Design a protein around this nucleic acid. Structure first.
Lengths: 207, 122, 142, 62
RNA sequence: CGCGGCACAUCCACCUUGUGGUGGGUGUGGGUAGGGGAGCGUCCCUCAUUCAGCGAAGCCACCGGGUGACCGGUGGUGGA
RNA sequence: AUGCCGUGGUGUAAAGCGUGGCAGUGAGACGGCGGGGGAUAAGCUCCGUACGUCGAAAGGGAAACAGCCCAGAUCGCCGGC
RNA sequence: UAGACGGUGAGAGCCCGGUACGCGAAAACCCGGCACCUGCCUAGUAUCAAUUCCCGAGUAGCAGCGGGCCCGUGGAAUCCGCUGUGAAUCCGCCGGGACCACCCGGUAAGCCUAAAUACUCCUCGAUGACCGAUAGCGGAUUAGUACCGUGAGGGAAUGGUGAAAAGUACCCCGGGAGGGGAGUGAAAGAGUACCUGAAACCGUGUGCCUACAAUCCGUCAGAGCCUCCUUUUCCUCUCCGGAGGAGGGUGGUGAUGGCGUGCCUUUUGAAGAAUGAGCCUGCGAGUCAGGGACAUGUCGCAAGGUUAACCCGUGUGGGGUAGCCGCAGCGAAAGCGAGUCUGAAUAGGGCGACCCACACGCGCAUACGCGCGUGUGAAUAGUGGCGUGUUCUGGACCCGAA
């Protein structure tokens, strides 16, 4: 509710109290389930194509007449049951996205983050740079010296000087801007790291 | 997502065939012909175990009758007498006694004869 | 986390796959016949050949006025509980409270004892609404 | 892509403010000399749909 | 009828006493079309975890297990 | 005579009613009992029974036997009546 | 600022080609900029009397026959086309759903007009809860080929050695192919016909039954042998083994008895002499889009709910209030409202509002409740998404006609 981490290459600074949105929420696993599966549904490209009768070349001829041949009533040379035939009830290239209520999305997100606050997994850091240029090595020492976990979510913002360059090439580390803070990354990652600006922007947008 | 439905089917094929072993001709070689036989065989086992129980009663009765006739008494009056005596002894072990100890069978016959009343009137 | 994330109990009903053996649903599966229903769906309209109810019954009498300006209906009891202090009632205020459809003309019903002495800046009041408004001590407008 | 309402049903049935549908009776448009006022009063008015076809009618309207 | 093992309703006394379950009683359990309920299994994505060239998959034989769909172990072939 | 409607008790486990969801059936057969059609006919056809069985019911019996007699299989038992 | 993929003898950040990122175009092309060149104007703007002309002609409009617009000649406007006739230039003409007076609007029969929108032969870079050789385009391999057809047209099958060919030197049988021995090789149980190598099928060796005996070719009883094996008489050879055997128990075989009329479909009804299947492997038949509809279960909210298109951005999140359903319904409609309609009125009737174990103020009542308000804390609901079942239009469970 009211805790702050240390500062890189320093001592301690900040001390920002977290609002109720990140603590007083009874997160519901069914809600988070539905929202997460919506995200996985959106992640699909829907490229699963096939070929049905009519796209298969030819097949309009009706060989093997119905008298004096002793063969089955063929009727077409590209029917499903034939080698090289069409696919019946195939995976047509669907294009979909499980549209959900915005209140469900927000409630699930603040629920997950509030659970992280309950377990002390929020590391609202201040920055990560050697002044202006990136240093992945120093990023490794910082993140692996304060968090000591595999999967980490990093929220910086629109700062590309030492934002999504120092944290890159760190297996398990993903990065995003506050506006795109989804839930799947939050549930996958444990020690969720925020910048001061990440907290100000998130809180301001979310009252 | 093509799944290649071979494996799942093979579990059935190899199970049914390894159980069907010993059947003659196109019974222990062909899945679809073996399958028929397992249905008929197991329906047969289902009724045959029960019939077996009845059959064993028939055999036991025949043997008891044979020994009883050797002691000059019928099965009818033998069982009637044993019931009057309260000798709740099954036909399995009674038929066993007929072989293991014929003298004990004779003793049971004397008990039944004594227990029987007098005649066929009531 | 995701490995502890579960669906709600009672939801996620399994899809009853139809043509997958006799123990699952059946060979004919619902369509346990040989007639039309087995092969295709008969239109719900068709009764059999006799005149369906759609032609058997007479045509609904009358017509529909194209120039019918429908008014939204405001419950004076809702006014009573919504604005217990009165003061002033605007249409923008009522829709701001969500008591009536946006961008529409309104009418006032009298079903409910009105105690709030408040003038209503709106349209088309009923005679009983005037009875209740003047009972409270207000004034009707249009 | 989008449902259709049977136009005859929309022109013959009238839904009420609740879960009820009524049918206009009008077997009185051809010959009205032999029919008594008793019979024409039985036909006059509007009658709720009998419960023996509402599961069909509601799908016909919707 | 008797003696044991499964199951479905109802009931008795309980544990989170209509969510969900424990001990016990009674009755019930042939069944196609058809309704409903509860499950096994092949493949695939993801998360946690993990055996794995000191030998996986697939396949074969054997021995075992589950009320069933089916599952495991051992040994051999093979080599990711 | 049976049978039907209703009523007051006794008895009964779910059988009933209403409102909804989803289907099947919409070709029946035989026997017994009342009929009619027919020839005082038929393993003929058409009717009724809250009469049954098969259909959808294995088993025992009728030598063999879907419809007749007895009887409604949860599973096991080298136990009985 | 490189943990994207792939390759290399097996699963590689650090071995390699590469990626991140930064450089990089003589010449040509495209784009953009600059100069030249090209090209327009010695004003009609403003106030005014309103004598005169003009504002697109065989056109408009009319009539007839047709088309099409929700509009099926119908009361049938607007628009287009054909055929005859045939006006006017501002006090004008046409339209505003037959039509007419009034009113608002714009001035036809002449031309041009990029963006927003649609599409992908082809060429880039990337993706994939897409396929892995009977799938994917028909075509991974001499593929629109071989081949069929007068021809238009129709239209196949064949993938995999091993890390490296290191493709078995040499010898021996044999005419050769082929095989064996040697040898390379981790392995030939990877030899060009080859990764893994199932089944049908063929065949051999061997344990067991069978030539006086009928039965969906089984099941249950069930002797005797075979094989595995415990205890044991016993061999005393015992620091070994257990030989052969009684008895007991697995895995085979099975003498002989009992019982017993293939499977599926369709049928009032089947073992079938009703149909169908030669066998094995593989392929294959109730699925999906939609802010669809109905019902139901769970999950968000709570008289509200919810956003579609669309904008920003990097994963699909944040915004977007136009709209929808609900909220008050009745009536042909006007209309009015808890009433409303028919109706002279409704006394009645169609439709919808309002359920107490009960107190306080109040009329009635022996007791029990009718009614106006606050609660003794009295009775209640829709909307959206994901699922399930059904249903509608979509090839609609699949295959099949003439």
């Amino acid at each position: 509710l009211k805790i702050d981490v240390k500062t890189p290459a320093g001592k301690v600074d900040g001390a920002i109290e977290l609002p109720a949105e990140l603590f007083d929420v009874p997160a519901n696993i069914a809600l988070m389930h539905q929202v997460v599966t919506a995200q996985r549904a959106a992640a699909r490209q829907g490229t699963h194509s096939t070929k049905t009768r009519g796209e298969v070349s030819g097949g309009g001829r009706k060989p093997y007449r119905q008298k004096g041949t002793g063969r089955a009533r063929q009727g077409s040379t590209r029917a499903p049951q034939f080698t090289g035939g069409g696919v019946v009830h195939g995976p047509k290239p669907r294009d979909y996205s499980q549209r959900t209520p915005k209140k469900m999305i927000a409630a699930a997100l603040r629920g997950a983050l509030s659970d992280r606050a309950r377990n002390g997994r929020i590391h609202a850091i201040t920055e990560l740079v050697e002044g202006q240029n990136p240093s992945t090595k120093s990023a490794r020492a910082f993140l692996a010296s304060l968090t000591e976990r595999k999967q980490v979510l990093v929220v910086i913002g629109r700062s590309d000087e030492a934002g999504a360059k120092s944290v890159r090439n760190l297996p398990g580390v993903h990065i995003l801007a506050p506006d795109q803070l989804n839930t799947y990354d939050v549930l996958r990652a444990d020690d969720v790291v925020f910048s001061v600006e990440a907290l100000n922007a998130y809180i301001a947008a979310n009252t | 997502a093509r799944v290649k439905r071979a494996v799942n089917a093979h579990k059935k094929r190899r199970s049914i065939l390894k159980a069907s072993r010993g059947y003659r001709g196109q019974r222990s070689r062909l899945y679809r012909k073996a399958k028929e036989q397992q249905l008929h065989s197991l329906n047969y086992a289902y009724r045959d175990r029960r019939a077996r129980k009845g059959e064993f009663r028939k055999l036991w009765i025949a043997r008891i009758n044979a020994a009883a006739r050797l002691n000059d008494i019928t099965y009818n009056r033998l069982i009637q007498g044993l019931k009057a005596a309260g000798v709740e002894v099954d036909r399995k072990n009674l038929a066993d006694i007929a072989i293991s100890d014929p003298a004990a069978f004779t003793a049971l016959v004397d008990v039944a004869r004594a227990a029987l009343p007098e005649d066929v009137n009531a | 986390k995701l490995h502890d994330l579960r669906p709600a109990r009672g939801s996620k009903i399994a899809r009853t796959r139809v043509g997958r053996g006799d123990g699952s649903k059946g060979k004919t599966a619902g369509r346990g016949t040989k007639g039309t229903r087995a092969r295709k769906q008969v239109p719900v309209t068709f009764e059999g050949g006799q005149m369906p109810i759609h032609m058997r019954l007479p045509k609904l009498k009358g017509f529909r006025n194209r120039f019918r300006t429908e008014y939204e209906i405001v419950n004076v009891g809702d006014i009573n509980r919504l604005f217990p202090q009165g003061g002033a009632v605007g249409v923008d205020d009522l829709v701001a409270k969500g008591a009536v459809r946006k961008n529409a003309l309104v009418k006032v019903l009298g079903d409910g004892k009105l105690t709030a002495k408040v003038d209503v800046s709106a349209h088309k009041f009923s005679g009983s609404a005037r009875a209740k408004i003047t009972a409270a001590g207000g004034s009707a407008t249009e | 892509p989008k449902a259709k309402t049977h136009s005859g049903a929309s022109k013959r049935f009238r839904r009420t403010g609740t879960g009820k549908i009524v049918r206009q009776k009008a077997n009185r448009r051809h010959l009205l000399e032999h029919k008594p006022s008793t019979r024409t009063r039985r036909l006059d008015g509007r009658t709720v749909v009998a419960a023996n076809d509402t599961k069909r009618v509601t799908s016909l309207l919707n």
